[PDB]
Amino acid sequence: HMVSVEEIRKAQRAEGPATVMAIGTATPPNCVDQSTYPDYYFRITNSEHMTELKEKFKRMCDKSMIKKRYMYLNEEILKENPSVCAYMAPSLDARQDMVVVEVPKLGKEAATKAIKEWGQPKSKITHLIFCTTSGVDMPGADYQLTKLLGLRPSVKRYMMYQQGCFAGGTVLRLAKDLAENNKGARVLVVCSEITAVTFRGPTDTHLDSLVGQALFGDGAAAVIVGSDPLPVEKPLFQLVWTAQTILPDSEGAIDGHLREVGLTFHLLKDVPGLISKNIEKALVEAFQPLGISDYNSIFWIAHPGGPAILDQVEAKLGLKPEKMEATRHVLSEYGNMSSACVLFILDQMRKKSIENGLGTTGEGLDWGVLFGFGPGLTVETVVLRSVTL
Amino acid sequence: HMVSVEEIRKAQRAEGPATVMAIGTATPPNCVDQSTYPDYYFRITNSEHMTELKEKFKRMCDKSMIKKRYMYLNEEILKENPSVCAYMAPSLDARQDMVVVEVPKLGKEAATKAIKEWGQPKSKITHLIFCTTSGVDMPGADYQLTKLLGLRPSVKRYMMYQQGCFAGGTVLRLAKDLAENNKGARVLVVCSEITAVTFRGPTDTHLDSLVGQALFGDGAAAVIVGSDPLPVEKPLFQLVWTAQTILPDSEGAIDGHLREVGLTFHLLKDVPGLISKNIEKALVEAFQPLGISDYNSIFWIAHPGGPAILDQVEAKLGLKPEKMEATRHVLSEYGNMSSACVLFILDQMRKKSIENGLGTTGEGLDWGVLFGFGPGLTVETVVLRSVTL
Ligand SMILES: CC(C)(COP(=O)(O)OP(=O)(O)OC[C@H]1O[C@@H](n2cnc3c(N)ncnc32)[C@H](O)[C@@H]1OP(=O)(O)O)[C@@H](O)C(=O)NCCC(=O)NCCS
Ligand SMILES: CC(C)(COP(=O)(O)OP(=O)(O)OC[C@H]1O[C@@H](n2cnc3c(N)ncnc32)[C@H](O)[C@@H]1OP(=O)(O)O)[C@@H](O)C(=O)NCCC(=O)NCCS
Numbered sequence: 104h105m106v107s108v109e110e111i112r113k114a115q116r117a118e119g120p121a122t123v124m125a126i127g128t129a130t131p132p133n134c135v136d137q138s139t140y141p142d143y144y145f146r147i148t149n150s151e152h153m154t155e156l157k158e159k160f161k162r163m164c165d166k167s168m169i170k171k172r173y174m175y176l177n178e179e180i181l182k183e184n185p186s187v188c189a190y191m192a193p194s195l196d197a198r199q200d201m202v203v204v205e206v207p208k209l210g211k212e213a214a215t216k217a218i219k220e221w222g223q224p225k226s227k228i229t230h231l232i233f234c235t236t237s238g239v240d241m242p243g244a245d246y247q248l249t250k251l252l253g254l255r256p257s258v259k260r261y262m263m264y265q266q267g268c269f270a271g272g273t274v275l276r277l278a279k280d281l282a283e284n285n286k287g288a289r290v291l292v293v294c295s296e297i298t299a300v301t302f303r304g305p306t307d308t309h310l311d312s313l314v315g316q317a318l319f320g321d322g323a324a325a326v327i328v329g330s331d332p333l334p335v336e337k338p339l340f341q342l343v344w345t346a347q348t349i350l351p352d353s354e355g356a357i358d359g360h361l362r363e364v365g366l367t368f369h370l371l372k373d374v375p376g377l378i379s380k381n382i383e384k385a386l387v388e389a390f391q392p393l394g395i396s397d398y399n400s401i402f403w404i405a406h407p408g409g410p411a412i413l414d415q416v417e418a419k420l421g422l423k424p425e426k427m428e429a430t431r432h433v434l435s436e437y438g439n440m441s442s443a444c445v446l447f448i449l450d451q452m453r454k455k456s457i458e459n460g461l462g463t464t465g466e467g468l469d470w471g472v473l474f475g476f477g478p479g480l481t482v483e484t485v486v487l488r489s490v491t492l
Numbered sequence: 493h494m495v496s497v498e499e500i501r502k503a504q505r506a507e508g509p510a511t512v513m514a515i516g517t518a519t520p521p522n523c524v525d526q527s528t529y530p531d532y533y534f535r536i537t538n539s540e541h542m543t544e545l546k547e548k549f550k551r552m553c554d555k556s557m558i559k560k561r562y563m564y565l566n567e568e569i570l571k572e573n574p575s576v577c578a579y580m581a582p583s584l585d586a587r588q589d590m591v592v593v594e595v596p597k598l599g600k601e602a603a604t605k606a607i608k609e610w611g612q613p614k615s616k617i618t619h620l621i622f623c624t625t626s627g628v629d630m631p632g633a634d635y636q637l638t639k640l641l642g643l644r645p646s647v648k649r650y651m652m653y654q655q656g657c658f659a660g661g662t663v664l665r666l667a668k669d670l671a672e673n674n675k676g677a678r679v680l681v682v683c684s685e686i687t688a689v690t691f692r693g694p695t696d697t698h699l700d701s702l703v704g705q706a707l708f709g710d711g712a713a714a715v716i717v718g719s720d721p722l723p724v725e726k727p728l729f730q731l732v733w734t735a736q737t738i739l740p741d742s743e744g745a746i747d748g749h750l751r752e753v754g755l756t757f758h759l760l761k762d763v764p765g766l767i768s769k770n771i772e773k774a775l776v777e778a779f780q781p782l783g784i785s786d787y788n789s790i791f792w793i794a795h796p797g798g799p800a801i802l803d804q805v806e807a808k809l810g811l812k813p814e815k816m817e818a819t820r821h822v823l824s825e826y827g828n829m830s831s832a833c834v835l836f837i838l839d840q841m842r843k844k845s846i847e848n849g850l851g852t853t854g855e856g857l858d859w860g861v862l863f864g865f866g867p868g869l870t871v872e873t874v875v876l877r878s879v880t881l
């Protein structure tokens with residue numbers, strides 16, 4: 104017969120739901136204690152004379168519910184790059200020189216761990232999604248990671264630059280379509296974030312910049328996503344349904360500009376209220392079609408943008424305190440790692456489910472939700488199904 | 493009745509091949525004559541003393557096979573922004589201030605034209621892909637376009653930043669999977685490119701930067717992509733098959749770095765040779781499964797990185813001179829508009845096929861190829877099917 108586009112389409116598409124088959128995570132080695140961060144930060148920025156501001160920063164750090172963060176930046180690198188320690192000094196070239204190298208390097212560590220868990224040859228990776236908010240370059244971090252891992256030159260790449268904190272949801276929403284539309288496709292997904300682009304000295308004029316310095320940390324996370332798993336692959340979660348929305352009345356709530364001074368951060372106090380005001384509508388869109396209206400009966404992964412977002416969502420919906428445990432655990436041990444955070448939380452939930460002998464990767468529950476929150480104000484929703492242990 | 497993930501997946505997916513249903517294009521109003529550009533360029537950058545370098549640049553402009561380009565930048569803006577006219581003065585903030593506004597605005601013009609051709613309500617747009625190599629911001633150009641067009645707030649966005657010249661292929665590879673995997677999905681795709689980020693003054697120390705000043709122009713293009721066309725929709729092309737690859741021995745052939753001086757361009761003389769040496773392998777991977785080995789029997793869309801790429805591909809494959817007509821037409825009337833170019837060429841091919849009464853939107857042929865070329869060195873391949881006129 105003559106080959107038709109309709110015959111090609113039927114032969115090239117996959118049959119089953121996109122399935123998470125591996126999760127790996129990595130951090131820079133420099134662990135920074137939150138209890139002493141105000142002293143460390145005001146010292147390495149030569150800002151000890153700003154005593155009232157330091158008291159404000161101490162309250163921010165004490166309320167952050169962060170115990171520690173990992174940071175590529177250390178005292179030696181800051182002494183070598185004093186423009187990065189200024190509040191607002193031309194410093195983008197110094198910051199780019201760091202993150203164009205370190206972002207794909209950290210992503211390589213996470214990716215190697217995901218590949219090791221998957222247990223399949225890396226020659227079988229057909230698609231790569233690389234996501235960061237930390238620097239840009241051409242060719243991108245996707246190309247650098249392809250070279251570092253030795254993936255096939257014909258890997259289909261999606262380079263997601265300057266995305267922000269909702270993009271852990273965005274990469275899963277993308278991976279889902281890549282895996283489900285392509286028979287055989289195995290998608291490597293990497294989110295890698297390094298705060299060397301946003302770190303800056305303190306000022307009393309832009310207190311929202313200081314909130315960033317209290318919350319943001321470094322990390323990379325990788326997942327393998329595919330449809331129609333082989334018997335030798337080990338499913339962890341299914342990706343069921345996705346949505347992205349812009350919240351009403353949220354213009355300018357979270358803004359970030361890449362300038363000569365690096366990545367600047369603008370943050371309205373309305374963000375927790377905006378998210379908690381709109382979250383039931385997002386849950387109804389996702390769960391009404393599944394016949395689910397009890398949000399204490401699903402497992403939760405929420406981007407921990409800060410503890411006020413988690414507290415206000417929990418209070419608005421009446422989530423029991425157990426629901427945010429995995430989310431709060433990652434906020435505690437790592438801080439806000441922008442796009443990577445919800446992937447660390449998915450890993451933490453699988454890990455705690457195994458440790459406590461629960462019946463599924465979703466804390467013994469069947470259905471789950473993953474939320475990303477970021478610039479827009481954008482909300483990403485991913486509906487998840489757990490796998491039985 | 494308990495809904496299963498397998499039942500959701502079956503109801504959620506589209507049936508047929510991703511179909512281009514509209515193409516719209518837009519350029520800035522300032523038309524720049526290539527025959528006078530060396531005198532304009534050397535004057536406005538205060539470089540008239542560099543008489544030997546100006547003769548070199550005249551030779552580049554004369555060989556470029558470009559007649560004119562459209563540029564957001566004009567004499568008035570350049571006099572207001574002397575930092576942009578230096579080879580390497582700090583200028584990123586002035587260039588960002590231009591392109592963070594102008595890229596989505598030019599995108600809107602193109603998108604409005606695509607939506608008009610499509611003839612459906614913009615409320616039916618489910619997915620938006622925005623692609624640019626010109627600036628970055630949070631929220632991104634995708635958010636700004638959603639606001640400018642009044643798209644639904646729940647439009648699923650894919651913000652493709654700092655991609656480079658191959659990404660007109662990339663956005664079609666992405667749109668194909670979004671349209672095919674999602675019943676009812678209608679994907680708006682916008683590529684918008686503004687050279688305000690790369691424009692800079694001449695120096696004999698970086699002759700590859702001067703090549704960029706001869707070739708790169710501004711423009712935006714938009715397509716609507718969907719599966720399962722309604723009877724009131726009008727298909728133009730089907731997207732059949734896609735590939736991305738990195739060419740062997742091509743490391744550093746095309747690089748671009750975002751610095752305090754704007755986007756810097758590095759370009760090896762190796763590029764045309766690398767592309768022509770590797771293009772047949774790309775064609776065999778695409779067309780041998782379709783039983784096609786005569787590359788004069790398919791319609792051609794090639795990213796016109798420069799005339800030397802097109803000349804060396806044509807000579808390597810023994811293409812008839814007519815095959816590259818639509819591609820050279822766009823190069824002649826618009827220059828190299830990075831990711832947008834191949835979409836202008838698809839429009840030009842449809843327009844010439846109508847003007848000349850050919851049987852199909854692909855110059856009367858059934859099968860076609862679209863190539864993107866850019867940093868990596870990356871080659872994007874898209875196999876197309878035309879539609880009858
Ligand atoms: C920062 C945070 C941990 C502080 O904890 P808290 O429970 O609010 O404690 P407080 O209300 O005492 O706030 C601490 C201080 O930070 C200030 N602050 C909080 N959010 C701020 C913002 N967006 N801009 C400026 N200052 C802010 C408060 O005004 C307060 O100052 P004060 O003690 O001098 O009056 C908490 O407000 C939070 O998690 N906010 C959400 C952060 C967010 O939007 N995340 C998304 C990042 S993309
Ligand atoms: C630029 C171009 C139009 C010049 O036309 P050409 O006649 O084939 O080349 P010529 O040998 O006459 O080149 C003219 C001048 O440009 C110079 N030149 C061409 N490509 C160059 C490069 N990549 N870097 C530096 N100089 C270059 C030549 O050395 C020559 O200088 P000269 O006249 O002082 O000797 C052509 O080389 C071209 O299309 N090149 C491909 C551009 C490319 O790689 N595109 C990708 C963009 S991302």
Ligand SMILES: O=C1C[C@@H](c2ccc(O)cc2)Oc2cc(O)cc(O)c21
Nearest residue numbers: 267296297298301320321359368441
């Ligand atoms: O400025 C930043 C920093 C960035 C980031 C966080 C952690 C990290 O490791 C690297 C980068 O996250 C952000 C997220 C935003 O929505 C807006 C922003 O302005 C920023």
Ligand SMILES: O=C1C[C@@H](c2ccc(O)cc2)Oc2cc(O)cc(O)c21
Nearest residue numbers: 656657685686687709710748757830
């Ligand atoms: O430096 C640039 C400019 C950019 C561009 C072209 C046209 C336009 O209108 C806007 C930006 O295209 C590029 C494409 C590349 O592969 C590498 C590059 O370095 C560049």
